[PDB]
């Protein structure tokens, strides 16, 4: 996260860290949507152009964390994956359309002050809140800057970061990039002349873009950090997977009933 701030303890209890077993490294962010399901971006698991193709045995899910590097004994919880599901129409070949994936945990996680699921939007909540100008919130342990000299510090935060950003009008999103945009994505961030700034960055991928409903005071995950050109560059915006538009697929693989 660039131009963000330290998160408060328990401010984002649905935040999940996708961690590679070996070499031990942070891969992406993710979100907890129930006791046995985690939501993330498909590009975190599968991206052929760079020979990235992870299986359930390759990673661990870390829930309830605040610190990025420490093993928060007695607080964070670790889970193994039973199975991964990538959207069958995930378009890694051209524009990352349908950049979404579900991960089933081997055993249900127990909730606590620091671990709690986020809600998925219903048709009307999405309708009321997904409007240009409305702000959402993005969190992650990703890089603090697009680039920074090596050995001279670390562009990595020691604690979860947070930043609030406004949803941007579709024509402005489209006119900011050469990539072909679809209805399954929306973009967010400040415009060059709005003064304030901020963006997600490398390492933040797969994390949640959430909004608080003023109708029922609940937090809803409206997007997933998908892609962006550089980090926090003027004239550029971060793009997110439109969760509500892919909800039927989500509900389908869950068959919770």
């Amino acid at each position: 996260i660039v131009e963000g701030s330290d998160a408060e303890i328990g401010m984002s209890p649905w935040q999940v860290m996708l961690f590679r077993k070996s070499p031990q490294e942070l891969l992406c962010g993710a979100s907890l949507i129930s006791d046995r399901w985690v939501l993330t971006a498909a590009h975190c698991l599968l991206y052929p152009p760079w020979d990235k193709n992870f299986t359930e045995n390759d990673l661990l899910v870390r829930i309830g964390k605040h610190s990025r590097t420490r093993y928060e004994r007695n607080i964070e919880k670790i889970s193994m994956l039973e199975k991964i599901y990538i959207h069958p129409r995930y378009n890694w070949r051209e524009n990352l359309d349908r950049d979404i994936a579900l991960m089933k945990l081997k055993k249900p996680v127990a909730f606590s002050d620091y671990i709690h699921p986020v809600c998925l939007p219903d048709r009307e909540t999405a309708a009321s809140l997904l409007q240009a100008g409305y702000k959402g919130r993005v969190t992650g342990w990703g890089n603090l800057k697009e680039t920074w000299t090596a050995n001279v510090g670390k562009g990595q935060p020691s604690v979860l970061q947070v930043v609030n950003l406004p949803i941007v009008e579709r024509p402005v999103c489209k006119d900011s990039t050469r990539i072909r945009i679809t209805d399954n994505m929306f973009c967010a961030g400040y415009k060059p002349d709005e003064g304030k700034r901020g963006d997600a960055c490398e390492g933040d991928s797969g994390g949640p873009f959430v909004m608080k409903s003023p109708f029922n005071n609940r937090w809803y995950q409206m997007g997933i950090v998908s892609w962006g050109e550089g980090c926090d560059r003027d004239g550029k915006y971060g793009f997110y997977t439109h969760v509500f538009r892919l909800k039927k697929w989500i509900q389908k693989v869950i068959d919770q009933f």
Binding site: R20, E25, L26, R70, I78, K107, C231
Partner: peptide
């Protein structure tokens, strides 16, 4: 879209797996 974050993380004891 140079950082991968792989080297300064603290080990996880086996007593934490599942």
């Amino acid at each position: 879209x140079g950082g991968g974050g792989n080297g300064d993380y603290e080990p996880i004891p086996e007593e934490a797996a599942x």
